[PDB]
């Protein structure tokens, strides 16, 4: 099921990972590295670790201050804040698994793919 508050971080209900860099290779494939909230090891989104995401054992997120996020996140973030210190707001986007495309980010009612999303 789920581990207790005492095991790992207490705030987390499932283990938490953050995509920290999204550089590309010579062939243009997106090399995604995600480190856990503790942050002492580097992993890539392999099927075995995606398989955890199907059962909710882990959760993946992206910061909006990432150096290579490709999409102009600050302008859109600034607009929403103005709708309802505005600059320096930072958010965590919850990455989800789409069987057809793999990891997608439902940003502003529009599904995206990590390769489409990142530079």
């Amino acid at each position: 099921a789920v581990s207790g508050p005492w095991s790992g971080n207490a705030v987390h209900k499932a283990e938490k990972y953050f995509i920290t860099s999204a550089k590309r290779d010579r062939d243009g494939k997106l090399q995604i590295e995600l480190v856990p909230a503790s942050g002492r090891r580097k992993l890539s989104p392999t099927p075995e670790m995606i398989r955890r995401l199907i059962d909710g054992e882990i959760e993946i997120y992206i910061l909006t201050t990432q150096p290579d996020i490709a999409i102009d996140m600050n302008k859109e973030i600034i607009d929403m804040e103005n709708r309802y210190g505005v600059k320096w707001t930072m958010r965590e986007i919850p990455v989800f698994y789409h069987e057809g495309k793999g990891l997608c980010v439902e940003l502003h009612n529009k599904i995206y793919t990590l390769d489409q999303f990142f530079k």
């Binding site: 508050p5 207490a10 705030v11 987390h12 209900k13």
Partner: protein, 61 residues
């Protein structure tokens, strides 16, 4: 005395069991980093008197 013991025992069972986390703050996704922190602020209708030092006060009171 039986009622007066079980009343102040509630504040004591909470120091023993909710020093770092409680079922509510595991739900609200929060950590009690500290033993003498007053509140987390107005948030969630407010959360004052949640540390174990404050639960000690509510056992003395």
């Amino acid at each position: 005395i039986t009622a007066g013991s079980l009343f102040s025992l509630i504040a004591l069972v909470r120091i023993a069991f909710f020093a770092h986390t409680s079922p509510l703050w595991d739900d609200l996704g929060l950590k009690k980093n500290s033993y003498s922190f007053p509140c987390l602020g107005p948030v969630y209708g407010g959360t004052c008197g949640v540390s174990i030092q404050d639960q000690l006060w509510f056992a003395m009171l």
